[PDB]
């Protein structure tokens, strides 16, 4: 079983987006009015699931082949790779990185998405990968296209891939979004602007990686994820 031997660096809730961000409309009715109750870390908070024993299919990380009904998806073939480290710069091995996205046109494979851009019969948009010993993950997919949404009258989400990172604990567990370098829609999105600090928005921008690109085949993007720093317990209860 799991033990209480780790302490996690307290989250900077001024770096992270606030609960109440008015421009992002749905946050108004879905944000607590009462203050969060601070509790010390215990075994309930400092431990979490390990997904090393989960049965991963061969194409779970490859979105170009994991839906396959008879062909290849239409769109810009890209590799989305990066490293998962903690605040101390320590790699996070054997961690679950889950991702989901829209197709080249910005259409998501869900019943609630009635956007006029057609579905790609060869694209699912779901991906999962367990990080290696050095904390590296890699996905092969197509660059998702931007999509409109009912927030403001002309609000468009920048091209993005949603990310879900488990980490060593439920305390480190994080769901975020990846944006693409140079996309002019980034400073205009209310979901991006929910983050007050501009330096924090930069941590979400995946950068073009020509070094990791496959010549005459696919481009690449680097997205490094930083999770809460893990430290050993010291001087607790004397």
């Amino acid at each position: 079983p799991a033990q209480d031997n780790s302490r996690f660096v307290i989250r900077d809730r001024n770096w992270h987006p606030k609960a109440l961000t008015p421009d992002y409309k749905t946050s108004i009715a879905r944000s607590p009015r009462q203050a969060l109750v601070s509790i010390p870390q215990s075994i309930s908070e400092t431990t979490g699931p390990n997904f090393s024993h989960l049965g991963f299919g061969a194409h779970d990380h490859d979105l170009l082949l994991n839906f396959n009904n008879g062909g290849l998806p239409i769109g810009e073939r890209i590799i989305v790779a990066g490293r998962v480290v903690d605040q101390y710069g320590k790699p996070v091995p054997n961690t679950l990185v889950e991702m989901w996205q829209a197709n080249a046109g910005g259409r998501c494979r869900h019943k609630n998405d009635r956007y006029l851009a057609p579905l790609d019969p060869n694209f699912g948009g779901v991906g999962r990968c367990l990080t290696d010993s050095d904390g590296y993950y890699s996905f092969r997919t197509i660059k998702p296209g931007p999509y409109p949404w009912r927030n403001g009258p002309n609000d468009w989400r920048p091209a993005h891939i949603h990310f879900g990172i488990s980490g060593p604990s439920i305390a480190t567990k994080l769901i975020t979004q990846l944006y693409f370098e140079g996309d002019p829609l980034i400073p205009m999105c209310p979901i991006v602007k929910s983050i007050a600090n501009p330096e924090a928005v930069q941590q979400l921008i995946a950068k073009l990686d020509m070094n990791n690109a496959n010549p005459m085949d696919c481009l690449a993007y680097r997205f490094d994820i930083v999770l809460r720093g893990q430290r050993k317990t010291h001087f607790e209860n004397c």
């Binding site: 799991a2 660096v9 770096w15 992270h16 009715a29 607590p32 299919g57 989901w100």
Partner: protein, 200 residues
């Protein structure tokens, strides 16, 4: 002062969270192994319970697109981190509320007692993380039980909540769903009877 590398900022899970994290609930084809609401298999030790609840927003309206992640100890009060579908019990599980089912379900056992960092016993609880559109950074909460009144009064985490009326929002009511032991835990994100959310 000393500044470490900044943590990657959180963003909302979005309206379509289910296509990537709750495939069956999204009506999309599933993969061989999925992480879902069946924490305990029928032959697992402990009192087998069914957990259900609804998520309410600030207007008292149902949140039919929520995604919940649970972390709990087994009947013996031990956390099983090694997730595998072949196991009789898994401490982790995911559940969701959909447009087709505005109520989330969880099949598990009643958790045993675990001590805090100071060695003081905490009352039987289930750690819940709530994600959805409109929630920029996930909300952490705990599910306590009403038939554990003696243990709930002594819990060090529950006693950190200043007002006793707010402690009640974390207590699941015992009921019965189809002749099976069940507990109802409704979460009110904002307003009247707002659920206590934690920071750690």
């Amino acid at each position: 002062p000393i500044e470490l590398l900044p943590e990657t900022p959180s963003q909302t899970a979005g309206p379509y969270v289910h296509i990537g994290l709750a495939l069956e609930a999204a009506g999309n084809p599933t993969r061989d192994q999925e992480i879902w609401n069946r924490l305990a298999k029928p032959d697992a030790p402990g009192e087998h319970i069914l957990l259900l609840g609804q998520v309410y927003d600030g207007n008292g309206h149902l949140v039919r697109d929520s995604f919940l992640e649970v972390w709990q100890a087994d009947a013996n009060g031990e956390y099983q981190d090694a997730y595998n579908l072949e196991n009789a019990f898994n401490s982790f599980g995911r559940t969701a509320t959909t447009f087709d089912a505005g109520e989330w379900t969880l099949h598990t056992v009643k958790p045993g007692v675990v001590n805090n960092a100071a060695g003081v016993p905490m009352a039987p609880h289930i750690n819940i993380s709530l994600f959805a559109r409109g929630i920029n950074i996930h909300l952490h909460t705990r599910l306590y039980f009403d038939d554990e009144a003696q243990a709930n009064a002594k819990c060090p985490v529950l006693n950190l909540i200043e007002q006793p009326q707010r402690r009640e929002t974390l207590i699941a009511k015992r009921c019965e769903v189809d002749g099976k032991t069940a507990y109802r835990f409704d979460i009110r994100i904002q307003g009247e009877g707002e659920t206590v959310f934690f920071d750690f």
